[PDB]
Design a protein around this ligand. Sequence first.
Ligand code: NAI
Ligand code: NAI
Ligand code: NAI
Ligand code: NAI
Lengths: 280, 278, 280, 276
Amino acid sequence: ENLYFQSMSVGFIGAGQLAFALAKGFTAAGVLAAHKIMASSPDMDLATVSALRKMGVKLTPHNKETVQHSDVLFLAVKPHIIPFILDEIGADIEDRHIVVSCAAGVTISSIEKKLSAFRPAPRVIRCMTNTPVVVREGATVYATGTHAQVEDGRLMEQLLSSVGFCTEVEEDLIDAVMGLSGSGPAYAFTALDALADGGVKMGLPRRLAVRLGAQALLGAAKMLLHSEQHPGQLKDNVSSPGGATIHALHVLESGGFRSLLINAVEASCIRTRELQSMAD
Amino acid sequence: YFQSMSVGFIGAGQLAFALAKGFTAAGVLAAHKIMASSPDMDLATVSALRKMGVKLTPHNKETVQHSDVLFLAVKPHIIPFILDEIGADIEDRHIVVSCAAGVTISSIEKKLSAFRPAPRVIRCMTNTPVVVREGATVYATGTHAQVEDGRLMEQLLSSVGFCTEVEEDLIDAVMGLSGSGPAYAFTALDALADGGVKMGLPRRLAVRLGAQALLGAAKMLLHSEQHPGQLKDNVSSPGGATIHALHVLESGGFRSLLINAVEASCIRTRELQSMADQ
Amino acid sequence: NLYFQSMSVGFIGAGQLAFALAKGFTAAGVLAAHKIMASSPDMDLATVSALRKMGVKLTPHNKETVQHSDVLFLAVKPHIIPFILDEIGADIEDRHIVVSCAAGVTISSIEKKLSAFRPAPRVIRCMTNTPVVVREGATVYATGTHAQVEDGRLMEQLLSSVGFCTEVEEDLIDAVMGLSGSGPAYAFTALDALADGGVKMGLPRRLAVRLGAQALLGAAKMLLHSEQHPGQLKDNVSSPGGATIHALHVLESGGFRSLLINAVEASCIRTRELQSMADQ
Amino acid sequence: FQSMSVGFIGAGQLAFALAKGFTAAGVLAAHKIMASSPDMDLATVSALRKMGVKLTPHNKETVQHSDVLFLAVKPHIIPFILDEIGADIEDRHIVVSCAAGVTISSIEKKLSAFRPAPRVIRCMTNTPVVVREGATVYATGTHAQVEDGRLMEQLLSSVGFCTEVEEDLIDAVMGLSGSGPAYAFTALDALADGGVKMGLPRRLAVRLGAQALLGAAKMLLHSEQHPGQLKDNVSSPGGATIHALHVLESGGFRSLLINAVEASCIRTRELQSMAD
Ligand SMILES: NC(=O)C1=CN([C@@H]2O[C@H](COP(=O)(O)OP(=O)(O)OC[C@H]3O[C@@H](n4cnc5c(N)ncnc54)[C@H](O)[C@@H]3O)[C@@H](O)[C@H]2O)C=CC1
Ligand SMILES: NC(=O)C1=CN([C@@H]2O[C@H](COP(=O)(O)OP(=O)(O)OC[C@H]3O[C@@H](n4cnc5c(N)ncnc54)[C@H](O)[C@@H]3O)[C@@H](O)[C@H]2O)C=CC1
Ligand SMILES: NC(=O)C1=CN([C@@H]2O[C@H](COP(=O)(O)OP(=O)(O)OC[C@H]3O[C@@H](n4cnc5c(N)ncnc54)[C@H](O)[C@@H]3O)[C@@H](O)[C@H]2O)C=CC1
Ligand SMILES: NC(=O)C1=CN([C@@H]2O[C@H](COP(=O)(O)OP(=O)(O)OC[C@H]3O[C@@H](n4cnc5c(N)ncnc54)[C@H](O)[C@@H]3O)[C@@H](O)[C@H]2O)C=CC1
């Protein structure tokens, strides 16, 4: 790791929520010192830029400055901004750069087409991560581009593994991963807010209900990750005949609880596709 | 490390295994200092506890004589039969910790006080993730529990997850939230994985990613001073895929279903204990 | 202590919005009613009679409004704007700032029409709402190609006298219309229903309307003056096991949140589908 | 210049909201307010302390300090409180119960066992007193003087709207304006989500949505028009607003808000039937 990271500099095009989250996770993991990170944004009036600055992250309005001072370049902007970014800094991408795109629905092919008009063989990697990298429990996948070298995938695997789970996938899976684990934390925060409301309805202080609900979800998720058993079998171990849990599971089933979560993953994926067809 | 402490389990099922596995993984109890009892010595939970090093026996009275801290880990309608069987063996030294859903401290103390006054009783509400040391536990102290008794139980149960003392009248609501909560989460994880599979992910990857997302979000909330709505705002980029997905959850009344669940579990727990009383 | 001593304001159209702005501007003291002119082909409209009682100068002839005015508000229905611009385009001078309040109408479409008569028309696009009438409006504006920096600063100063006002990129304006432009109608519907609920439970209608409106006003003010998330302020009202958390559950059971999201989306979509029909 | 001493039994969300509102209005000095709680570790207690409010664990000290004594505890706590401090209520006291559902009759019954003629007023208010835009009603008890009702109207009018009602309206007011801020906070969160879905930054969507609701509410308070007529003035034919109003109607939006007021009122009544 020392060899990969000792003198590596990282740049963020964009200084929003994902840039802050990855920067916080990388520095908390100890892989990167905050001053070796640079972020650029046209609007300095954001709370994320303030948090990055108090972290010690170097800030600039000029994306070309971030490009000049970076080895690994994360594109942390909305999908529709990507092709305008590539036109802007494309003349500055050099052999040394690894361009890591975080946007969903922006293909490696389209990024490589843009950058290859300036210099052949751009090294491009697509990444799909989520905000819990900020506590080093992210869920990350990546796909390597046509010109990515052998050490490039291995470097990205080690970098993103320091802030959570990380595995290589074929590029065609990435938009579906966005619908599941990219959007997933928002599903979990909605559920935790509602579970806490349920606790409050039944008499619990709100502070206690939030803590218990979150701890229950965290523990159940860890249980599944550590067990070889199917989620339904773990559910069965918790639901005793005639008991409180099986009564509660019935009212979840009666509202189509499962189908709402399937609807959510699908809706996220569908939206990513229609954004992509607006560009393409 | 409580080295001088002998722990017993009346009942050798899912909860006894989860606690004993958690305790020994935390290093607070040695497996050989734990005894568990069940009338069926060929149960699969019994086998798992045996492979752990726990001492096992079919005689509930043997577990009582071995133990200082005695966990009641039987189903709720068995608690009265158990208290009658061993009540004469309860000694001054014993702390009786009932894990049974719905069973009140009053009903345990009344049954045991017929044999010996001032039984030391603690009521505990925990959940199965103690097995990976990420449980959510609350406890209430009884009439005759000393102060050190509550501090002792909090030390023990803090080693396998979050633990805090509550007034007893909150415990049925806690059961509806964190006691049944793992089952809500396993249902949600199965469904999120089906959604990933529908959109083209391999099942095994979808289960791993869905569970990791839920774990990471829960950890984010536990480590943050922010409202869960504010953390949700940070995922939801304007016009983006996430806010579109959240709309379809809202259109189905997702929030209300989870409130329904906590309510139903809490209400059933009260219903059952009303039948026990009368 | 703001007052525009050398500014003549004109309104093409003398309907709800012209009345609301003229009343807000005059109550703010930043304009005398006699320095305001409004035109409409219906001199027997109820809004025209109100403007006349304020002191506002009225005329049936749009050309007279243009000749009197420095700042010219286009306060007609969107499908009337192109006929307006053809009628008075030859009367636009260098001194004019043209401020379109019409829902959906793009700066591009206005500039194209006026530029046929005289190059470099100074155009600002504004999205406001009817509570400017009580000086609590919510307004955004976007500046056109030829609007000078002082033009936007001036309009911000003027529109800030009747409520909140900030500059936005033009492509946000249709979404603002769906939120704060249509928003007062959502609130009037909500206040009618809340009053019905109060009456069902035994309150006199006049009291229920007063309390419902006061509750909404107070809650909105709390949020504006707080750095807290609206979910956290809700938690402070929702005592465990109490009346409020029981009532919140029945709102959630009906999908209350999703209905308000549906509304904002439906307003914004309809605006875009109208402007597409106009552009084709 | 009345130099009133005010006490709160309970130092939670409503006690903080009222203390903040009263001191911001200038009617009370913070250090002339005393609040008591057995849990001296809440966020509300820390905020009261920072305001300069006097804090004590002992309800008797609050009673002895106060001229006007607010009962700002949960409804099921009120009879425990009246048993504890009933012997300390004096003829000079005005006892103002804020508790949802607790009747004047039950309060006077408890306190009359100690001194005859306890002066009792029941009030129903809401958290926006914190920004002096509260919605408050009050009802006077058997022994409250006419001056006692005038004083309470003067005091509560300093932090928002205030009017006297017959007591049998108070539980319905709770369902409308007492719980009402929670309905608005829910609506504002959802409207902001809708703004974000259509491409607005969250910070701007929150601000525009709240300003929209504030302005519309103020319009209705300053107008003699029916809310349906104000709605008609925003709704041009074929336009964006009337399309959005239709999707609200299709989901039964109106009935959800009626359901909420009713559910709050029913819960209040069923809690009181438990205590009784
Ligand atoms: N936030 C999340 O939960 C996750 C986000 N993503 C993706 O990551 C990307 C970034 O999302 P967020 O950080 O949430 O968004 P954001 O809106 O918080 O941040 C975007 C940033 O880009 C900046 N920006 C805009 N135009 C720019 C330009 N031309 N040059 C430089 N900077 C520019 C903005 O000023 C802002 O600082 C998006 O594609 C999103 O879909 C993917 C996974 C999770
Ligand atoms: N499993 C869970 O998710 C949680 C369980 N609990 C409570 O823990 C208690 C035990 O639950 P589980 O372990 O899931 O049950 P289980 O059904 O898995 O195990 C119960 C055990 O009691 C034994 N048993 C039955 N009759 C007995 C008797 N007369 N003497 C001794 N042992 C006897 C059975 O053989 C079995 O080993 C219940 O009261 C439940 O409410 C509490 C919170 C969560
Ligand atoms: N009313 C609202 O809630 C808001 C309205 N707007 C926009 O403001 C514009 C005007 O809306 P309102 O005042 O509500 O409409 P309105 O229907 O109340 O008034 C329209 C006025 O235009 C006049 N008019 C028609 N043809 C004309 C012509 N050829 N020359 C001059 N005047 C003519 C009519 O006589 C009438 O006085 C619309 O484009 C609407 O989208 C924007 C935001 C809020
Ligand atoms: N919070 C709101 O939005 C409104 C609340 N109310 C009513 O106001 C009352 C108080 O509500 P909140 O302040 O929101 O509740 P809360 O739970 O925030 O405050 C209750 C306070 O009472 C204290 N307390 C508990 N037992 C006590 C005792 N024996 N002696 C003294 N203090 C004790 C608690 O420590 C806490 O400080 C309730 O009856 C509620 O129905 C009425 C309308 C609006």
